Symmetry: D2
């Protein structure tokens, strides 16, 4: 059973301007918050320059002059499924994010799906070799678990003795095992992730993930991510580049 | 002129549950996001127990059990004014917040306000010594500025000439000079900030700040901040403990 | 082929007291640096108190009064082998360390070792089920790799060709696969790691790593890591608590 | 009275190669640790490439391909004196350092020194204005301190009484007041600080600090800091620029 990548946006920033500040803007939520924060450094609430007189204009300028720390005020959360364990192992190396991830120490592996590496996707023979190997691993897991459950029956706590058995049984589960994860980060963190992972140096799985995150981030905060350009490589995979990263 | 502490909540989490996840809860925003993230770890979406089906009950349990990392998903931002420079010098030592602060390099301080230390708030004579000293500093600052702008006549760029002068002139501005700051943190970082700063060991200025943030945070997310109990000290200042 | 846990201490803080500061202590390296930094807050260079007039006494005082940020100045690095991929996936959730880890994308995984879960180390039957499962996975790996290199045959860069094949082939490699990692952290990060992972709540594999790290750290900085008491549980695994 | 900038290197990395790894290098300390960490990723313990078979060649390569995360393993600590309170307020915005700083709540300041802004150092008239204002501020501080100690007489704990008094009295102390601070960071953090602070956009005081840190860092680890070129500006201050990050 194979699992496709799904990225669901589950949280963003709600903004409410302070009533006493003599400033309004062209925008809502995160992008308005970022402008407000930038202007707070200068206490410059008026709008002399027509170019930076819209929210998008202001943000593009903030970006251009390298005031990136202002972007940290707004955050976005995704719920991600159809991502492999090897992919999450790379993702969580990014330390300016917060994560909550499906636990193999706790969750049943009996119905677990696998994620096909993008370089194999179009090849039914390779996919077959993968899913068969995954079926073999799952049978092994159930084998180990049954025996381990009996070994750790001594222990009164239901939650402990279930962890002890599954945590050892998990040893046979492959890299391609599906996982699920809530990832939260601010705009500055999201931008770094995209610059690092939406590139030809990156594994094609996390690259695909980064591109999908960028597309969804651009939908909620266009002005913040507009400097990123998506291009398609010879193999048809997608990369994103920005002059500011 | 003096400036009182003002704390204004300007941003918080907006949550939309994923349509295809078979789960609901009796909350929205940050508290609902926290519960979703917690349950994602176990895929424990079904809620058969109607006596543990509440968001508040789940959030309390998350913290009884000590899974504090789940709290990081939700954030709140404040715009804080009427805070002194010595106070922000303490505040910014907290490395899990994001900040945007009023710049003395960029902002003229000829009209700047003073923040009165809570310890001298009820002594008019002491406040007078402070405001007189502030006025003298501001005069010195204006004297230095004019003399620096001339010393920097060599600079053809008028914006840069004014920044070079201002950043040097700022040297005489006192600790009690008002500043203004946007502070953003997730629930975990706010909790830690409150624990450290709303305590008898902390300076009264930042303690006042922490108690006020707490009061607003507790209204926004009761279950997350309910464990903190405010206590009034012998001297009338407030502390908070969990 | 199985791999035992090995933790090797490969780096630590070298301290040189600045000459024109009227202060000395009965210690070296990391512990000495921590006292220097704590004393710099107070400029308390002379030692009026005979109790904290020793380095060990000064550090125990720092801890009791809760001044844990001073511990961040000193650091230690380990090279860890005989750790599984599922163990590293847990370890790297600690965001206040720095890591350099063996790459499956970059390193040919021919003759990879497997780490046996401590829970089945005494069970020869369970070990065998594991090791032949691992053997089957490596066989599948070689089969995919060969087909993948054939598939990407067009790709002109041969290095990039092997990498594209290897990153996809790695898909069948089990959690138990051995990995190797350099981990660097300051004393405060190390203490937090030990507290969270040398506990009954934690997986037994990371718990074992945390205990061994603790033993080596306590040998390097006794005063910093002394409060941790190691006790053997019912099943004969160790936990450490302070 | 006035305090000159002083930067003292007080800690760095001690390295010992694990005996059972088949690798040696010609370097010691931080730079050797960085090579070890980089080789661990590839388990490339042998040395086939005369271009990367030395520590300097290896680090040259690490720097060119930009895997700066391996630089995080080595650290350096300085004790910095003759820095102003406005300079530390900028410095501590860098969140990947660790700090221990002289406390005004805790340490008496009746006799504290003043730091002259670089843009003012050459001018006797401006220096006099500054020192005169500092003398006035210290007199006010003393005046406030005594009255506050008297106002807080109903605190039986004299230590607390002096602190309660001092923390309020410090209200009048100017930005130019000298402070002292231990700063610890890894190589990657120091590179970022230098890049951000030893620049034309930065305040002259912190730029002077960054340059001195850079000078000491590049003497200790020349391969790590070689890309930073020191340039004298027209006003006689120095900046540092690099093609890298
Ligand atoms: C193609 C590629 C190949 C890779 N190969 C390997 C490999 O072989 N082995 C391996 O172990 N990893 C490898 N990685 C992981 C990589 O080295 C980083 O650890 C990971 O990508 C996180 O990115 P980041 O380093 O920018 O840190 P993040 O955690 O994403 O932090 C963001 C930024 O914050 C700063 N920062 C965060 N923490 C610190 C700190 N403690 N000190 C100083 N500054 C800090 C840095 O500026 C950093 O850029 C690879 C990554 C890529 C994309
Ligand atoms: C027994 C146990 C069970 C676990 N179960 C799960 C699970 O089911 N699912 C899952 O995804 N993870 C799980 N984890 C991982 C856990 O939630 C943490 O992510 C991990 O242990 C890292 O430790 P830490 O949260 O204390 O933070 P670290 O990353 O080690 O940071 C140390 C300290 O820095 C501070 N800090 C760091 N980053 C932030 C931040 N951005 N905001 C505010 N403060 C910050 C906090 O004070 C923190 O305590 C589990 C861990 C344990 C030990
Ligand atoms: C010339 C100049 C002008 C400035 N003007 C102002 C101003 O007017 N107002 C003001 O408030 N500040 C101002 N600053 C401060 C500036 O915004 C930064 O806060 C400070 O320089 C720290 O640098 P850093 O942002 O790169 O963060 P560092 O703390 O130095 O972090 C290093 C890297 O880690 C990563 N990182 C750290 N924390 C996070 C996070 N929480 N989320 C995502 N990534 C993270 C980023 O990649 C960052 O580059 C100014 C600084 C300079 C040099
Ligand atoms: C009453 C009191 C007195 C103080 N006195 C002094 C003083 O005299 N001199 C002085 O310099 N400072 C002093 N401070 C500042 C204090 O040391 C901290 O720097 C500040 O309170 C920030 O809090 P924090 O250390 O918990 O770190 P935060 O930056 O708030 O981080 C939150 C958590 O993240 C983790 N974390 C963040 N960064 C790291 C890191 N690099 N390594 C490991 N873990 C990390 C820690 O778990 C920490 O608890 C004082 C603070 C208080 C409240
Ligand atoms: O592109 C990469 N991304 C990444 O995050 N790593 C980190 C993740 C993991 O902690 C370790 C080994 O990763 P791979 O097995 O995916 O190569 O290095 C390595 C490479 Br190459
Ligand atoms: O209660 C405190 N809070 C705090 O943040 N510091 C930090 C802030 C600054 O970096 C340095 C000196 O602070 P004070 O001048 O406010 O003591 O230590 C110190 C004390 Br005591
Ligand atoms: O004890 C734990 N330690 C841990 O680090 N995690 C993190 C690591 C990974 O990101 C995710 C899933 O971990 P397990 O598969 O090991 O449960 O949660 C979870 C548990 Br439970
Ligand atoms: O060059 C700068 N460096 C800096 O760190 N800040 C931060 C420091 C402080 O938190 C706030 C105001 O700093 P200045 O008063 O030094 O501008 O912004 C601002 C500027 Br401009």
């Amino acid at each position: 059973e194979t699992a496709p990548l799904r990225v669901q946006l589950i949280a963003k920033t709600d903004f409410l301007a302070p009533p006493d500040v003599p400033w309004t803007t062209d925008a809502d939520g995160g992008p308005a918050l970022v402008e407000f924060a930038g202007r707070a450094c200068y206490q410059s609430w008026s709008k002399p320059n027509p170019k930076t007189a819209t929210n998008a204009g202001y943000l593009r300028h903030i970006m251009d002059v390298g005031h990136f720390s202002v972007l940290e005020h707004a955050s976005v959360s995704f719920y991600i499924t159809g991502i492999s364990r090897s992919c999450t192992h790379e993702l969580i190396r990014h330390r300016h994010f917060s994560y909550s991830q499906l636990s193999q120490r706790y969750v049943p592996e009996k119905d677990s799906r696998v994620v096909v590496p993008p370089g194999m996707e179009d090849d039914a023979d390779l996919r077959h070799i993968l899913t068969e190997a995954a079926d073999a691993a799952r049978a092994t897991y159930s084998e180990l678990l049954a025996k381990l459950e009996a070994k750790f029956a001594d222990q009164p706590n239901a939650i402990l003795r279930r962890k002890q058995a599954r945590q050892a049984a998990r040893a046979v589960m492959p890299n391609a095992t599906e996982t699920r994860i809530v990832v939260t980060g601010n705009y500055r963190a999201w931008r770094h992730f995209i610059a690092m992972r939406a590139s030809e140096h990156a594994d094609v799985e996390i690259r695909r993930l980064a591109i999908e995150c960028l597309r969804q981030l651009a939908a909620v905060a266009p002005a913040v991510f507009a400097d990123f350009e998506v291009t398609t490589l010879a193999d048809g995979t997608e990369v994103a580049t920005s002059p500011l990263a």
